[PDB]
């Protein structure tokens, strides 16, 4: 083939690839959990490696376009226009790829935060089961032994409160810096506070019943 035909073949292939990547990068799937965000991050790494491997494909197509544009044999305006368009599309793909990377990393941080919150909610739930006891002591000796167990539990809740505040502080930062949607973090933070207040209230009600 001549240089015109080789460029046209290369451009048909490059154009198809650009269309594929444009469609892939328009996905707003940020995942539902840490395992699915991790799969999206692996997928996105491979795509970014594919884009990187095409930046040299683009250099070659650019060199072909520049050689074609020196020709006196045909009107080179279609070559010039194609070169402009493949370059503009490629640069937009690099911008979309960086934006999707930032959102996937944000999503990973958010889902890791949710896992950290789940560990705290499991702690809360274990303690809530302890203070849900409706044994208030058969006698003076029996309530004295329950009152000493309950003061130890209240001291555990007070010593854990900095960890609960740390979850709220982290959640505020993530919410304020969020670009992918705050509906889930808002709901989870509210539900988390409800879980902590419920445990504190149930512990305080039980403590009053042991006096
Ligand atoms: K914990």
From Swiss-Prot:
Which domain of life does the UniProt lineage start with? Eukaryota
Question: Repeat Spectrin: residue ranges?
Answer: 3-106, 108-211
Where located? Cytoplasm, Cytoskeleton; Cytoplasm, Cell cortex
Q: Which family does it belong to?
A: Belongs to the spectrin family.
Q: What does the subunit section of this Swiss-Prot or TrEMBL entry state?
A: Like erythrocyte spectrin, the spectrin-like proteins are capable of forming dimers which can further associate to tetramers. Interacts with ACP1.
**Function, in words:** Morphologically, spectrin-like proteins appear to be related to spectrin, showing a flexible rod-like structure. They can bind actin but seem to differ in their calmodulin-binding activity. In nonerythroid tissues, spectrins, in association with some other proteins, may play an important role in membrane organization.
Spell out the protein name for this chain. Answer: Spectrin alpha chain, non-erythrocytic 1
Gene encoding this polypeptide? Answer: SPTAN1
Shown residues within the full chain = 1662 to 1872 of 2477
């Amino acid at each position: 083939a001549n240089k015109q035909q080789n460029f046209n073949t290369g451009i048909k292939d490059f154009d198809f690839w650009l269309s594929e990547v444009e469609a892939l990068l328009a996905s707003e799937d940020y995942g539902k959990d840490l395992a699915s965000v991790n799969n999206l991050l692996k997928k996105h790494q491979l795509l970014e490696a594919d884009i990187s491997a095409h930046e040299d494909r683009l250099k070659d197509l650019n060199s072909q376009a520049d050689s074609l544009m020196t020709s006196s044999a045909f009107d080179t305006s279609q070559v010039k226009d194609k070169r402009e368009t493949i370059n503009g599309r490629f640069q937009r793909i690099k911008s979309m790829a960086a934006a999707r990377r930032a959102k996937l990393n944000e999503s990973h941080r958010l889902h890791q935060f949710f896992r950290d919150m789940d560990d705290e909610e499991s702690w809360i739930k274990e303690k809530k089961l302890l203070v849900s006891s409706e044994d208030y002591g058969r006698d003076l000796t029996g309530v004295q032994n329950l009152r000493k167990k309950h003061k130890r539990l209240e001291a555990e809740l007070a010593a854990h409160e900095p960890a609960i505040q740390g979850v709220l502080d982290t959640g505020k930062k993530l919410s304020d810096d969020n670009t992918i949607g705050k509906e889930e973090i808002q709901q989870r933070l509210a539900q988390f506070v409800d879980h902590w207040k419920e445990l504190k209230q149930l512990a305080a009600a039980r403590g009053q019943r042991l006096e």
